[PDB]
Design a protein around this ligand. Structure first.
Ligand SMILES: *[C@@H]1O[C@H](CO)[C@@H](O)[C@H](O)[C@H]1NC(C)=O
Lengths: 50, 50
């Protein structure tokens, strides 16, 4: 993927590895080495009008 | 081929009968035993008394 990894306070259960959003997109991921929860946010995008 | 166990432990004050309510069973362990199972039996403890 591609995004910004921000440390998050998601209440991940010990047996849960990632948290798909309602849109079934992997919103948060458990870091495999350090068992911590990192929220994933898509890098900033938008329209550009002139 | 995976033997999955889900478990839940709740304090119930009811004296007899299966309680009425909701409680989700968090996974306990999954084992790749890979065997065929068609029957099962429960094991109980015995209290030896004089
Ligand atoms: C190795 O990974 C395990 C499990 O994620 C973790 O507990 C441990 O701290 C890691 N150690 C190193 C060397 O990264």
């Amino acid at each position: 993927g591609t995004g910004v990894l921000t440390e998050s306070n998601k209440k991940f259960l010990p047996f849960q590895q990632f948290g798909r959003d309602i849109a079934d997109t992997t919103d948060a991921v458990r870091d495999p080495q350090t068992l911590e929860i990192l929220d994933i946010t898509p890098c900033s995008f938008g329209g550009v009008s002139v | 081929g995976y033997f999955k166990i889900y478990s839940k432990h709740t304090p119930i004050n009811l004296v007899r009968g299966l309680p009425q309510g909701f409680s989700a069973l968090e996974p306990l362990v999954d084992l790749p035993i890979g065997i065929n199972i068609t029957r099962f039996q429960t094991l109980h403890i015995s209290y030896l008394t004089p």
